C-alpha cells in the first residue's frame, strides 16, 4: 500500500450567492478528478464522508 500526502494551495472559483448581505451562507464547490485516467483503469472512493479538520485553525 502507498499512503501519500503532498501539501498544496488551491484557488477555487465558487459562485457568490449574495442575497442576504452581509450575513449569509456561501456555497463553494470544489471538484477532484484524474485528468489522465477515466473510469477505465482507476476508480475513486472516499474513505470518510466528512473532510477531516484535525489540523484546522
Amino acid at each position, epitope marked *: 500500500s502507498i499512503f501519500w500526502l503532498p501539501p498544496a494551495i488551491y484557488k477555487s472559483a465558487c459562485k457568490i450567492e449574495v*442575497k442576504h448581505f452581509p450575513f449569509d451562507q456561501q456555497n463553494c464547490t470544489m471538484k477532484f478528478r484524474s485528468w489522465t485516467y477515466d473510469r477505465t483503469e482507476i476508480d475513486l472512493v472516499l474513505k*470518510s464522508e*466528512v473532510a*477531516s*479538520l484535525d489540523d484546522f*485553525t
Partner: antibody
Amino acid sequence: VQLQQSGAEVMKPGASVKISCKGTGYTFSSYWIEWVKQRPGHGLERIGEILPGSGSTNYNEKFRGKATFTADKSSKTAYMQLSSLTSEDSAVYYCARYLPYYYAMDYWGQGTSVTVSS
Amino acid sequence: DVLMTQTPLSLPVSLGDQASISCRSSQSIVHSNGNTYLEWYLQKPGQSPKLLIYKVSNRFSGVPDRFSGSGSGTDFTLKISRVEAEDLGVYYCFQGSHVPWTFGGGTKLEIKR
C-alpha cells in the same frame, strides 16, 4: 462509531458540574456535536452544539450563560463547564452527532443522569 | 425561534388503524436551495430516541415502510398505517431551516381498547 458519557453526578445546588463526551469510530474533529436536555417530566430542549475543530459555539436564547462548552483535539473529548445550578435543571443529558443541511443524527449516546440535591 | 405545534397531544388508536399527526411551524421553514429539512424522532421509555423520517420526502435506511411523511411547504403530517406493539412512545419534530435549531412539543402515542 460509539459514544461514551460520564457516570451519575450528584452535587449540592450552586456548584458546577462537568460531564464528558467521548466519540470513537469516526472523524471526531470534523462535524458538529450537539447536546440535548430532557426533563424527566416532558418535552425535549436543546442546550447547544460545538465544532470540535474550531472554537465555534452557539447557544439557545433561553439557556444563555448557563453552560460553556469546550473540546479537545489531542484527546477526542468534549467537556461542559456548568454555571450556578438550580433545582429546576435536574434532568437527563444526551449527546449526539450532527451535520447541518445534510445527513444527520444517525446515532446517539446512552444517557447521563444528573441528580442535584442538598 | 420557530416554535412547533403538534396536534393532537395524544391520539389513542387501536392496533392496525391508520393515525396521522400534524406538526406546524410558526414561520416558513423552506430553504432557498429548494429542500425542506425536518427530522422526526421516536423515543421509547428508558431508551435513546430513534430515527424514522429525515428529509420527509425520503425514508430512513432501516425503518420499515409502515411509516410515511408528507405535507406542503408549511404543514407537515406523519402517518402510520398499522400501529404495532413496538410503536408505543413519543414523537418529536425537529426543524432544520434557521439558526438556532429547536425541537417540538412531544406527541404521546399509545394504543387504545
